[PDB]
Amino acid sequence: IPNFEYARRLNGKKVKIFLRNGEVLDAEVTGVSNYEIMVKVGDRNLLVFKHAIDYIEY
Amino acid sequence: PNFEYARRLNGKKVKIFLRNGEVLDAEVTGVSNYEIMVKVGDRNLLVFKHAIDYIEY
Amino acid sequence: PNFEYARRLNGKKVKIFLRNGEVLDAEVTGVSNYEIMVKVGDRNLLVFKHAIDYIEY
Amino acid sequence: NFEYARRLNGKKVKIFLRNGEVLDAEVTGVSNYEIMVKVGDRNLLVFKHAIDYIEY
Amino acid sequence: NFEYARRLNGKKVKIFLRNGEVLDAEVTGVSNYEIMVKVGDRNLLVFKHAIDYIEY
Amino acid sequence: PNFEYARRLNGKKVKIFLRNGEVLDAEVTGVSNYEIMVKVGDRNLLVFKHAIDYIEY
Structure with a gap:
């Protein structure tokens, strides 16, 4: 399916985003x-x- | 065509070697x-x- | 498709966090x-x- | 879709990864x-x- | 195919590469x-x- | 359009400056x-x- 992605499913949810620079963001996703x-x-x-982004924990 | 091996990893236990040195002992649930x-x-x-640099499976 | 959130920043004062650690206090003049x-x-x-890693706005 | 990497299929190669590691490898798929x-x-x-480069 | 980088084609610029290197350069092609x-x-x-960014 | 200068390097001796800090004193045999x-x-x-970061030709 063209353009299918799991990151959209994180909209609205609270997640931890691990950046390539080592930073970690305690974040709420408002758009993808x-x-x-x-x-x-x-x-x-x-x-x-x-x-x-390296990975996201949700 | 437009084929990719990573899809065959669905369902499998793998070790994922990230670009930052981390290694994940993981089970693939989606690709x-x-x-x-x-x-x-x-x-x-x-x-x-x-x-991801590479995956051992 | 033809959408991006960055276009929303055009004309704004932002902080740009580069992948090299620099942080630019910038005015966006084009995207x-x-x-x-x-x-x-x-x-x-x-x-x-x-x-760019991310942008504060 | 022309690529040289396909021609390495079946070959023994040295793979120089971006972190400095090197892989003595047999290519089984591309x-x-x-x-x-x-x-x-x-x-x-x-x-x-x-991968940075591959020696074949 | 809109890109700003084309507009530099004749200019003297400073190019800041991802490894920290800086180039004092005259653009000749893009x-x-x-x-x-x-x-x-x-x-x-x-x-x-x-390239990380370019000062022009 | 699909234009890329690198195609011109085919056949030439060049110095390749890799993202890792290496330089390759190389002859281009294909692009x-x-x-x-x-x-x-x-x-x-x-x-x-x-x-590749850049190439001296």
């Missing part, structure tokens, strides 16, 4: 596109590039 | 074009293929 | 498929998206 | 993004993106 | 994935994926 | 979308473009 993921981390809004 | 779902102990993980 | 144009102080930079 | 190898007793799926 | 530069007396094909 | 084939001394290398 092909190449990006939108999250709230505390007071912060972040646009995270999927290419920068 | 898409860019991601691999695994259970590691009690932990549910979505792992991006770009962060 | 293309693979690049973001920013003014950092007096400098004009063309920043490749692949070099 | 897809668009992956190379399947046997390294001694081990079966590996190697992503091309993690 | 393709989808490459930028051709003269740095001093050297002729370089620089891959865009190796 | 595809994703790969460059080189002879470095008596050695035959398949070099992935993604692992």
Whole structure:
């Protein structure tokens, strides 16, 4: 199926995002596109590039 | 054509060697074009293929 | 498809966290498929998206 | 879809990974993004993106 | 095929590579994935994926 | 359009500067979308473009 992806299923959910730089984000996913993921981390809004993510725990 | 070996890993116990040195002793629960779902102990993980060097199966 | 969240940043003051540890306090002046144009102080930079970890906005 | 990597199928090669490791390997399969190898007793799926170069 | 990098085709720019190296360069060519530069007396094909950003 | 300067390097002696810090004193024997084939001394290398930073030619 063209464009199928598991990351969409994380919308709305609270997850831990492990970045390639060692950072870990305690985040709530507010949006997912092909190449990006939108999250709230505390007071912060972040646009995270999927290419920068190693894995996500959910 | 547009074939990929990673799909055959669905259902299998593998060791995943990440680009940062970590190794996951995991069971593959799903595979898409860019991601691999695994259970590691009690932990549910979505792992991006770009962060994987190689997989031992 | 033809959607990206980065286009929403055009014209905004943001913090760009590069993959090299640098953090650019930037004004976004353009967004293309693979690049973001920013003014950092007096400098004009063309920043490749692949070099960006995330952006605070 | 032309690629040289396909021609390595069946060959003994040295795979230089992006972290510094090297693999003495027998190529058993090649897809668009992956190379399947046997390294001694081990079966590996190697992503091309993690490889720097290959000596054949 | 909209990209800003094409607009640099004749300009002197500073290219900041992913490994920390900096190039004082005059752009001579730009393709989808490459930028051709003269740095001093050297002729370089620089891959865009190796570039973090460019000051122009 | 599908244009890439690397095709011109076919046949030439060049210095390849890899993302890892290595330099290859190489003769280009073939070029595809994703790969460059080189002879470095008596050695035959398949070099992935993604692992190349730049090339002096």
